[PDB]
Design an enzyme around this catalytic site. Structure first.
Site, short mmCIF file in Angstrom:
data_model
loop_
_atom_site.label_atom_id
_atom_site.label_comp_id
_atom_site.label_asym_id
_atom_site.label_seq_id
_atom_site.Cartn_x
_atom_site.Cartn_y
_atom_site.Cartn_z
N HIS A 1 0.84 -1.18 0.00
CA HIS A 1 0.00 0.00 0.00
C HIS A 1 0.88 1.25 0.00
CE1 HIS A 1 -2.78 2.98 1.73
NE2 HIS A 1 -3.79 2.15 1.56
N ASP B 1 3.24 -4.01 8.14
CA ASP B 1 1.94 -3.38 7.88
C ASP B 1 0.89 -4.47 7.98
OD1 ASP B 1 -0.42 -2.30 6.83
OD2 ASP B 1 0.53 -1.51 5.01
N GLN C 1 -4.43 -5.52 6.94
CA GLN C 1 -5.32 -6.53 6.35
C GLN C 1 -5.13 -7.90 6.99
OE1 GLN C 1 -7.75 -5.93 4.27
NE2 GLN C 1 -7.20 -3.80 3.78
N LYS D 1 -10.80 -1.02 9.95
CA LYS D 1 -10.88 -2.29 9.24
C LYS D 1 -11.09 -3.48 10.16
CE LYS D 1 -8.15 -0.71 5.40
NZ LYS D 1 -6.80 -0.66 4.83
N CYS E 1 -4.71 2.11 -3.87
CA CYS E 1 -3.55 2.67 -3.21
C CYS E 1 -2.37 1.72 -3.41
CB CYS E 1 -3.83 2.90 -1.72
SG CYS E 1 -5.14 4.12 -1.48
C1 PLP Z 1 -6.02 0.50 4.54
C2 PLP Z 1 -4.56 0.09 4.53
C3 PLP Z 1 -3.61 1.02 4.92
C4 PLP Z 1 -4.05 2.40 5.37
O1 PLP Z 1 -4.65 2.26 6.62
P1 PLP Z 1 -5.45 3.52 7.32
O2 PLP Z 1 -5.80 3.15 8.75
O3 PLP Z 1 -6.65 3.85 6.51
O4 PLP Z 1 -4.52 4.71 7.38
C5 PLP Z 1 -2.28 0.64 4.91
N1 PLP Z 1 -1.94 -0.57 4.53
C6 PLP Z 1 -2.80 -1.47 4.13
C7 PLP Z 1 -2.29 -2.85 3.70
C8 PLP Z 1 -4.15 -1.18 4.11
O5 PLP Z 1 -5.08 -2.14 3.71
#
Ligand code: PLP
Ligand code: PLP
Lengths: 386, 386
Positions: free
Chosen positions: A122, A199, A202, A225, A344
């Site tokens: 992302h 990160d 997900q 999420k 993104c």
């Molecule tokens: C949605 C997402 C982000 C951004 O997260 P936010 O809390 O909206 O800032 C970063 N990395 C991944 C893999 C995402 O799915």
């Protein structure tokens, strides 16, 4: 055992109608719907316990501070952190990554160093490292993809060297649903003295996540999420790394300005809700839903899927030569919410030589019947536009 | 005409009991209580309209984007901005000021320049300028205070010169309730080509605020102090200044990562609620409540007040030689919530040669009767501890 009908009953948006038709919400990876236990926990805090939280003398302020620190403790148990003080409330995964890139990156990445990301990241896990590298004159290196949406792990020996300071890597791809071999990649990175930021935006809603077992140095995820309110995320920092992050004492140093106590209370309720369902039960139901969808989608003509067969959560696709925007609009016209665009993840789109993809999310409150509507809808769109 | 009993009925926290006694919440300047119209607007959005907002194709996402842009438009009318696109959703006043200090400050303040703040600023309007000055080698200059808590305006000719790039100044002091002569100070600053950032976090709930009439270049305020949810604030940027802030197009460039749509919806409801009451009605009621309090407090022995007689919103005080912490604890033991400490204004405390003060807020839902409890409580504390 998991009962999707009982779960769905907790989510008041799922009864909504769109374009006169019953909503099929297949966009949870963009943001998840929220159960009423989460909505009401936040509302109830505002209704009966609201105050500022800076260990203020008076009772409401002291009780609100304690509520917020109890959520911090619950979040650290949720990801099996060693200590609640390793968890930082941030505005979101985007801000949490940026926080690390400035607080830790600025004083640990120098000219001639390199940082490793992947081609499936992302933008929130690309742009802060691009900026840091230009600030200090370091090099940004990129693990490439295989056609099946997995990482080309064979390229790691050409990317990791003595000057590799950080690996920043997605736990689960928000487009492909690929789950990366974090534990092994972290062992490699640590052999060169590199730190690892994961990160996990997900990942944390699909199965248990244990940062002690992973041994990652940073881990970030998003409240909205994880069936929680907007404006709140979690940054995990291994306590050892606070000595490498110069400035009061930690978690709270990285929480300037007024905390989002509304969002924190709702995030706590979301962790409780998810834990009560059980992440292994959720994983099992979502895996079976996913297997049903990939099997049914075989009967859609000229469907292109992107990603590995063992994807989690999302199905990225394009239909014949039709633009994703048009496929998404027809599906929305049937009451089916998918996401279209570059998600993104423009480098990922460029790797597959498309400008955009469609993406259907299959979350714990989605049904076989909603999968059938998506399959039928794609067949109808193909007939009508082919 | 204003009816405080009808207003109070909208705020469910105000019926709360503390230490077995009816709450007297005199800490709105730290954070305000929220009416149920605000609480329910946010809950209702989560219940029936929730989705991600990146002009996503599907209906809920498109409707949520439009809801958020309508709140942006309503906020710009609330402060009489020329254009909705001049308003940026930020996490809070702290973040909004920091955003300006990095986006605008970094490319407009160079070595040998100076920035002017005041001795009454909240830390959120001090620390970003200290950091920027050290980054670029500029000088931070400070307008000093008079004993009555007003600015020493006579020092301005020694502080403003050709190298003054920015004046960063509070609209209303969060400790003293002093309201600064912004319009005149902005004329002076602009005569030297300096821009003006106004910290308005303690202004926007007390009377109308018109950024066109003020001609300020930046204006920031906090949602949670304007009877709204946490995690959301507003940054106004004069459209002309986007050419001085290098990077897509504005407002949205400064809103990275997922917007706090929950907080945005609640902030819109708070603006509506405040506008329905009418800021001039609110001002008139709060001014009369304040005059009643200052008159009654004359009968508290050995009370020290800090600030001018025409203060807005807050009364800063200390009682004899007793530590503010102890005065605050006794008042809390009576069910009265005031704030103690340095109030994020240590330079202000140092000017008055105290480590801490007590602070009572008198907001639109507070009563003469609650003022009487505060007066009685201070008399009781003085008898018991003197
Ligand atoms: C949605 C997402 C982000 C951004 O997260 P936010 O809390 O909206 O800032 C970063 N990395 C991944 C893999 C995402 O799915
Ligand atoms: C509360 C306050 C701030 C900080 O605002 P947040 O929204 O909590 O970040 C800044 N300035 C003043 C004058 C304040 O009263």
């Amino acid at each position: 055992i998991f009962s999707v009908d009982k779960v769905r009953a907790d989510f008041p948006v799922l009864s909504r109608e769109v374009n006169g038709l019953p909503l099929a919400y297949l966009d949870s990876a963009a943001s998840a719907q929220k159960p009423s236990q989460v909505i009401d926990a936040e509302a109830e805090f505002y209704r009966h316990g609201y105050a500022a939280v800076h260990r203020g003398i008076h009772t409401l302020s002291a009780q609100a501070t304690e509520k917020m620190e109890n959520v911090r403790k619950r979040a650290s148990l949720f990801i099996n952190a060693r200590s609640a003080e390793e968890l930082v409330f941030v505005r979101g995964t985007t801000e949490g990554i940026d926080l690390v890139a400035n607080s830790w990156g600025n004083s640990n990445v120098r000219a001639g160093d390199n940082i490793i990301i992947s081609q499936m990241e992302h933008h929130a896990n690309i742009v802060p490292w691009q900026m840091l590298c230009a600030r200090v004159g370091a090099e940004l290196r990129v693990i490439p993809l295989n056609p099946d949406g997995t990482l080309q792990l064979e390229t790691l020996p050409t990317l990791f060297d003595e000057k590799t300071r950080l690996l920043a890597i997605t736990h689960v791809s928000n487009v492909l649903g690929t789950e990366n071999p974090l534990a092994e990649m972290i062992t490699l990175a640590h052999q060169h003295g590199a730190k690892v930021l994961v990160d996990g935006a997900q990942a944390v809603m699909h199965h248990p996540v244990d940062v002690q077992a992973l041994d990652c140095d940073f881990y970030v995820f998003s409240g909205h999420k994880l069936y929680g309110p907007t404006g709140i995320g979690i940054l995990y920092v291994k306590e050892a790394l606070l000595q490498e992050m110069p400035p009061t004492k930690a978690p709270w140093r990285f929480e300037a300005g007024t905390p989002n106590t509304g969002g924190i209370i709702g995030l706590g309720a979301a962790l409780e809700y998810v834990s009560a369902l059980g992440l292994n039960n959720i994983a099992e139901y979502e895996q079976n839903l996913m297997h049903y969808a990939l099997s049914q989608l075989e009967s859609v003509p000229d469907l292109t899927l992107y990603g590995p067969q063992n994807r989690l959560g999302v199905i990225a696709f394009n239909l014949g030569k039709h633009h994703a925007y048009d496929v998404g609009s027809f599906l929305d016209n049937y009451g089916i919410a998918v996401r279209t665009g570059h998600h993104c993840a423009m480098p990922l789109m460029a790797y597959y030589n498309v400008p955009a993809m469609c993406r259907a999310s299959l979350a714990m409150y989605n049904t076989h019947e909603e999968v059938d509507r998506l399959v039928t809808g794609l067949q109808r769109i193909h007939r009508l536009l082919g």
